[PDB]
Design a protein around this ligand. Sequence first.
Ligand code: CLA
Ligand code: CLA
Ligand code: CLA
Ligand code: CLA
Ligand code: CLA
Ligand SMILES: CCCCCCCCCCCCCCCC(=O)OC[C@H](COP(=O)(O)OC[C@@H](O)CO)OC(=O)CCCCCCCCCCCCCCC
Ligand SMILES: CC1=C(/C=C/C(C)=C/C=C/C(C)=C/C=C/C=C(C)/C=C/C=C(C)/C=C/C2=C(C)CCCC2(C)C)C(C)(C)CCC1
Ligand SMILES: CC1=C(/C=C/C(C)=C/C=C/C(C)=C/C=C/C=C(C)/C=C/C=C(C)/C=C/C2=C(C)CCCC2(C)C)C(C)(C)CCC1
Ligand SMILES: CC1=C(/C=C/C(C)=C/C=C/C(C)=C/C=C/C=C(C)/C=C/C=C(C)/C=C/C2=C(C)CCCC2(C)C)C(C)(C)CCC1
Ligand SMILES: [Cl-]
Ligand SMILES: [Cl-]
Ligand SMILES: [Fe+3]
Lengths: 35, 33, 37, 33, 35, 447, 333, 340, 81, 33
Amino acid sequence: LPEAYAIFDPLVDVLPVIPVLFLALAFVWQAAVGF
Amino acid sequence: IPLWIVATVAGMGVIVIVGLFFYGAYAGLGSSL
Amino acid sequence: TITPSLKGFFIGLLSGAVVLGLTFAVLIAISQIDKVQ
Amino acid sequence: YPIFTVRWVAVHTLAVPTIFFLGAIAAMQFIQR
Amino acid sequence: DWRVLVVLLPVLLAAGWAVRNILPYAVKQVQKLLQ
Amino acid sequence: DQESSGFAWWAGNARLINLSGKLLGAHVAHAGLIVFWAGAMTLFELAHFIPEKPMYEQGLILIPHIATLGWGVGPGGEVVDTFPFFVVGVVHLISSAVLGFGGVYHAIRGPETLEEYSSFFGYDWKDKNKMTTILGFHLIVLGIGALLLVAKAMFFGGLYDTWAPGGGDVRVITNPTLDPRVIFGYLLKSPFGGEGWIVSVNNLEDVVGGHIWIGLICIAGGIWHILTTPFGWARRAFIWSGEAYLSYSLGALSMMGFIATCFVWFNNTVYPSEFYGPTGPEASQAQAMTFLIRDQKLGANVGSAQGPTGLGKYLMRSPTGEIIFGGETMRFWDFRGPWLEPLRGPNGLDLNKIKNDIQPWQERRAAEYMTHAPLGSLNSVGGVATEINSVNFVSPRSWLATSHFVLAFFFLVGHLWHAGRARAAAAGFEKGIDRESEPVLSMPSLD
Amino acid sequence: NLWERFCNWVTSTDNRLYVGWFGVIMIPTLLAATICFVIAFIAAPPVDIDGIREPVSGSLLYGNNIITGAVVPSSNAIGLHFYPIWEAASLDEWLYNGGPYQLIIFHFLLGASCYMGRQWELSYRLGMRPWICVAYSAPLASAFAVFLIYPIGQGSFSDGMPLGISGTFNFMIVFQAEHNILMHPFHQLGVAGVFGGALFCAMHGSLVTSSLIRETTETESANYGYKFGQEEETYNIVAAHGYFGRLIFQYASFNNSRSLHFFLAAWPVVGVWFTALGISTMAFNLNGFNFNHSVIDAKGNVINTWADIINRANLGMEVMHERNAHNFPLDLA
Amino acid sequence: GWFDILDDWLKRDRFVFVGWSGILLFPCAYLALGGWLTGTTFVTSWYTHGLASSYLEGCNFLTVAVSTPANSMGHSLLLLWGPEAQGDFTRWCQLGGLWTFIALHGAFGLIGFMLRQFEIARLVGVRPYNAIAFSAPIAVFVSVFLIYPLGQSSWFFAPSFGVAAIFRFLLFFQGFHNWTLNPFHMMGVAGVLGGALLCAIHGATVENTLFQDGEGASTFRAFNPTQAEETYSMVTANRFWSQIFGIAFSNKRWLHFFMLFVPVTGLWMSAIGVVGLALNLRSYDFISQEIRAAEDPEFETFYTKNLLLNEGIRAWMAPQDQPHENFVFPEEVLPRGNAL
Amino acid sequence: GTTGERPFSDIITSVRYWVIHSITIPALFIAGWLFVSTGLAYDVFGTPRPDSYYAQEQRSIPLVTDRFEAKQQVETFLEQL
Amino acid sequence: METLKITVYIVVTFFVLLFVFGFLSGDPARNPK
Ligand code: CLA
Ligand code: CLA
Ligand code: CLA
Ligand code: CLA
Ligand code: CLA
Ligand SMILES: CCCCCCCCCCCCCCCC(=O)OC[C@H](COP(=O)(O)OC[C@@H](O)CO)OC(=O)CCCCCCCCCCCCCCC
Ligand SMILES: CC1=C(/C=C/C(C)=C/C=C/C(C)=C/C=C/C=C(C)/C=C/C=C(C)/C=C/C2=C(C)CCCC2(C)C)C(C)(C)CCC1
Ligand SMILES: CC1=C(/C=C/C(C)=C/C=C/C(C)=C/C=C/C=C(C)/C=C/C=C(C)/C=C/C2=C(C)CCCC2(C)C)C(C)(C)CCC1
Ligand SMILES: CC1=C(/C=C/C(C)=C/C=C/C(C)=C/C=C/C=C(C)/C=C/C=C(C)/C=C/C2=C(C)CCCC2(C)C)C(C)(C)CCC1
Ligand SMILES: [Cl-]
Ligand SMILES: [Cl-]
Ligand SMILES: [Fe+3]
């Protein structure tokens, strides 16, 4: 990463897993509506 | 306390603790290093 | 005479007899308090 | 509802040591040779 | 040795703490049983 | 709720089948996830990238795609500036937010059905005209996208070309192959060994050319489907429903996924070994080369050296006579790569060129590719299974080949699933057998 | 019309065996593979599977019994090349190089793929729900894995599973030496699938036999209490669930027959799917977990585990498989 | 009477039924499972095998084992109060005492569980075929963990309780007994795999021959456990398999008994053959083949190739798998082909 | 039907439960931690520490050779450390 | 050899054409309801 963005290089380590969480949230939601 | 909250936090506790076990597999005892 | 292993044998015998005794003692007691109708 | 039952004992002889063991296994990840 | 009391301490505290939060609700259970 | 539609929570997206506004929403929302992963994964790869190491020693699959398109790299694949990687990730990531915003809006806020909101976006699955029209638009989009690759190769910097003289480099593609006997000759080769079907495309001209062709084929078919309705023979040969079309694409996505597997496993043109690590056949051939060079330097006569089995130790013939590398690599003699083709004469490997013309950069390349063979354990220990820990490496090729075979296999299962159900829903027994009209109870007995 | 009569018979439900359009491919291809397998098992001459001119005998007439006999895979010199009869100068050359293997496996894979489609097809003609063929996809995928997919990734049909009892074991052993498939979680899920399937099959059968409703005397079979096509269920699901729910606890039991039968399908099929996928992805040398020398002491001495004992055994298979075929020190083919 | 009072309490309808069989089952099962969990977390194998085997030492879930006692203990019961440990909990663990503890408490647990199936079956009103079928798991456990090491020199050559340890056991049995060649194991394969097949195919058949008893597209709701009618069509499932495969079930009772028979029969056959391997009474060879191959060096089958592999396994793994033998193989005796 | 205990649903939902168990579950967990962090688990079970598998100049594995004096043989091994 | 190759090519073509043309000759309509 260009050093002007080096401040986010911790945030980059997490970003690719965000789509997975979307799968998990659909279960939180169906749990909250009682399936 | 709504169960769906209890379900999410328990699993979240599960995911954290499993992640700690996989983490240790690359560091310290049993890491090959 | 009583060799070390024969002493151990009684150690085990009494241990098991204590375990089964406490077991059946407690099980009979519970059964007397919480009977059926 | 009663509070302590045969089930109560059964869940606690499995669960008490499980959490205890997960704790011990947790700390093991930080052992360095 | 000292390590044993270090380890048992939380469990003792937890048990006592649970004993104190459950005690009124247990002595009624036993009282209900004695019939 | 399941009482309203029939479908249960675990089959909840089937409640979207006749709600075009929400269905549009999920689709646009899903496309954002793809674009999100693409951008996010790129920045992760760039945050972990080391220019002094080859890309394949670092677990990278996206930066290799970007570099093959000619962005970021110089001669022989060396990374010279990383800012084009950065852009590709940021732009995808920023775009995903747009795709997400619209997807969520259509999902929970927009109108559930489109058919009363607009007669142009609305669609009924059983309406064969509107479906071919939507198909036509998307065919047009696909054609444009395939031409964007042409344009990048011909007008906008070119492509990385592992075959370029002097060693691979970025190169502008001036003369794409348009000869239909070549372009569609690939589509007619055998899938089997030494042939390769479309996987054998080994020059950028043939790649760029084929894309000009499907680019044109698609736009034409798009126009054709916008203007026509399905003929009568197609009407009675197909099932016209949303699930039916979903199954048709699962079969296709499956076929494509298998093909993708073979491409990244065998092909080192559109998957430059400079970026992806050697192929399986390549690393084995590279091993034989490395030991040929070493033993010959010691004084061995690699043409007449007999091996334990009686076959040649360094050199034997193929079943059609060609001089090939010996040993168990005999199976890999269809391999072709730029580090080895200089030693290839018309009859195969040329013993004179082996003796006098091997260059240091070849010995370096063979050794590098021998010790980076796509072999490794699930936890990325490099080598055969019996290898001790030390080398952290699995080839991107293994990672890409294995994942897409899994995805392909499961999408074939998906095709079988939704196809049969589509057929049963249309016929009216996808929910089970009517007790009062059981079909078998009215057929005669087999005996 | 004459073509419509043909089509009416191809698709008839009154045929003792259903033919169908999938069957128009299935019947000839299976018959070809079956006839050639029978003949080669009995009579084939030795085949040079490892392409090192050391032929391997596999047929009965050449000194094999039912256990040691195989149709031997085609030569390593052939690799992935297509090798029908007409590509060979003579039947003699074809037999020497492994021709019947390709003929058989390609006809069989085609025939079994159409067997799967035949299952969808007759089910559609009968008014059935359609997914039985999805279950059969799990063994079909497994067959695809070991006859086709694993040769592709390795680069030769000579690493295909031999068509023979001992040949199969030679496949499993060399596979474990090369890929450590016991330590691969996809084979472990396959074990969990076939063991679990065996268990659940055992369970369901004992639980239903247990709940059979008395309809017979003692001097006859309990089976004669069921008549083909009665509308009454023959066992008592409530009693069976009453039993099994007490065996464990009630919520660990099934009270819905459809939910239980779905579980019976899903557990082995999924697990076999994964184990097909394990062969199919080890084909591209993504291998099982490697823990060799993973545990170390403070000085740096290796402290073996059971993984390192598995490695010593893997090593001994490794240096003995294809004992003459390697001229270079890495096993890359 | 106090016996009839204790019977009243043991047979109470609770969440977890106890019964008379519970007095045996629960403490033994809980102690078998607790002993495995205890050892895989804390207990080494450095003095019995020279192996690490606990979470505390660095092992993961696939490599932890409660390992067998050293060969020198023979078939010692290895009781805590016995002569080897002499009541020292620490030394008992270091000597392999958890292995016999688990195996023995486990063996008795399995007796308790089978008695449990009997006890519940009689109280509930069903025939006891579930307990009959559980004979096959017991027969397997007894032959592999008790008889097989009793046949051999010690508990050492029993399976150690662990995932990778079990895999080594599998590989030992190929290299040493040529277990794949044994027809009693082959019959087990055919009953395990044939059981998987029957499980998959019967579940699919029922799910794909259901009657339409609801209007929902998820078809599970259309069953009530108290209903009297079959939920799927035996007639239709019969015609289908008749025309697809040639033969089809026509009797639901025979079909479900057959699902009991097959995997139960097969596990019992594999036990029998393991009993043979206790005595090294292997199906290791075919004498006819060895006579041909010794006189004809151009004879080569897959059978003769497997034996080369078995010989490689034995020489390459024995020095560390059998460390009480003080084996030292100089490199030149190791069998190996060219290059590798 | 229902056997008679309080449903687990109502229990992990009720406030009294999590009053009690937000202390007990962490207590045992911390207890387990301290069992390993104090080094007690090493001595209770006799499992070697990373510096107690060999002596500083030894690659021979301390294998138990004798059945009946085995307890003493293990302790003669620990002394050579 | 070549006579065999031509013989099998004809055979294969024949059956493949039975398959495509059979499944185009109105398959969905061939069902019980
Ligand atoms: C890729 C995954 C995906 C997607 C895109 C969808 C999308 C959809 N599902 Mg499906 N679903 C999925 C997975 C998915 N589903 C899975 C895995 C399951 C199994 C658990 C289900 C189970 C399921 C059921 C049971 C149902 C749906 C339904 C729906 C639709 C309405 C949902 C609703 O009412 O939400 C309401 C929920 C909320 C309002 C909570 C908030 C949700 C949003 C989307 C959070 C977005 C967060 C994001 C970061 C914001 C971005 C902001 C932007 C500026 C960038 C919707 C089109 C429903 C349907 O068909 O109705 C007719 C329905 O009944 N789904
Ligand atoms: C096709 C997709 C694909 C491929 C080929 C790769 C390949 C790679 N990734 Mg990437 N990755 C992907 C998707 C992919 N990734 C996705 C979707 C995410 C988001 C979570 C990421 C996030 C990610 C990160 C954060 C990292 C990688 C890294 C890597 C490397 C190491 C992989 C590894 O060790 O995995 C470990 C293996 C596994 C976890 C095994 C998973 C097995 C799956 C779950 C089987 C699923 C089967 C089936 C689909 C289930 C349904 C069955 C049902 C229907 C019956 C490797 C080069 C690493 C790297 O080196 O970066 C530089 C790294 O740090 N990836
Ligand atoms: C496939 C995507 C798609 C589709 C089919 C639709 C369809 C529809 N949207 Mg939706 N929408 C989408 C994406 C989509 N939207 C996205 C991504 C966003 C977020 C930016 C929105 C935000 C949005 C809003 C806020 C609203 C709609 C509304 C509408 C309706 C009216 C649109 C109209 O008249 O446009 C007429 C045509 C135009 C305005 C010109 C569009 C020019 C495009 C954008 C040029 C770029 C084309 C290029 C190929 C894009 C590449 C994308 C990249 C990822 C490859 C219609 C049903 C309206 C509605 O239903 O209200 C009730 C409404 O209020 N949409
Ligand atoms: C995404 C792409 C796509 C899709 C989904 C469709 C879909 C459709 N097209 Mg369109 N079409 C497309 C692209 C597409 N088309 C393009 C790009 C063109 C321009 C070339 C055409 C030209 C075209 C024409 C000329 C016609 C259609 C028609 C149709 C309909 C019937 C298709 C059919 O019967 O196929 C089934 C395929 C066959 C029956 C072919 C016979 C079997 C072949 C030989 C199988 C070979 C497969 C095998 C595995 C080999 C593959 C690899 C390689 C060797 C080829 C259908 C609605 C028909 C219609 O009704 O239009 C109004 C019609 O006449 N399309
Ligand atoms: C296709 C491959 C295949 C198949 C299907 C089989 C099938 C079988 N093999 Mg064979 N095997 C194979 C390949 C195969 N093998 C190969 C290639 C080798 C190498 C030569 C071996 C080596 C091998 C060995 C060494 C053994 C087998 C045995 C078996 C049988 C094991 C049956 C079983 O369930 O035991 C499982 C064990 C039990 C059922 C015992 C009871 C267990 C209780 C009920 C468990 C309860 C657990 C409790 C509730 C708590 C658990 C908690 C915990 C998980 C946390 C079975 C017949 C075994 C045998 O024949 O035994 C007689 C045996 O010892 N195989
Ligand atoms: C949705 C996720 C799908 C996952 C893959 C498919 C799983 C089931 C496939 C078995 C096919 C068996 C042969 C015929 C079996 C058959 O005939 O099924 C019949 C049964 C009932 O069918 P219905 O007609 O009622 O429902 C299907 C549609 O009609 C929707 O109503 O189908 C289902 O219940 C599907 C359940 C979907 C939900 C599946 C989730 C389970 C997998 C979870 C992930 C496990 C991962 C393990 C990792 C180690
Ligand atoms: C429908 C639905 C669903 C789904 C949803 C979705 C799928 C959504 C999506 C969403 C999305 C798809 C989103 C996205 C977003 C994105 C974003 C938000 C981004 C942002 C970015 C940025 C801001 C950037 C930044 C930067 C730069 C500029 C440079 C470099 C560094 C950084 C990174 C810092 C679910 C399943 C839940 C269920 C319910 C219903
Ligand atoms: C780009 C490129 C290229 C090219 C490509 C191309 C040119 C392609 C084409 C392609 C094509 C041209 C394709 C096509 C395909 C086809 C298909 C895939 C088909 C399908 C079919 C179907 C699916 C059918 C079915 C059926 C039957 C069989 C019977 C009746 C019924 C039905 C209809 C169902 C090249 C290689 C040069 C190079 C690289 C780049
Ligand atoms: C030995 C012995 C004994 C006993 C003891 C006991 C009884 C113990 C118990 C113990 C226990 C009782 C423990 C527990 C543990 C547990 C654990 C350690 C767990 C873990 C878990 C996990 C880790 C999970 C995982 C998973 C799964 C599996 C599912 C999903 C996925 C996951 C990953 C989440 C006595 C002293 C009496 C005597 C002497 C000897
Ligand atoms: Cl071999
Ligand atoms: Cl070699
Ligand atoms: Fe059944």
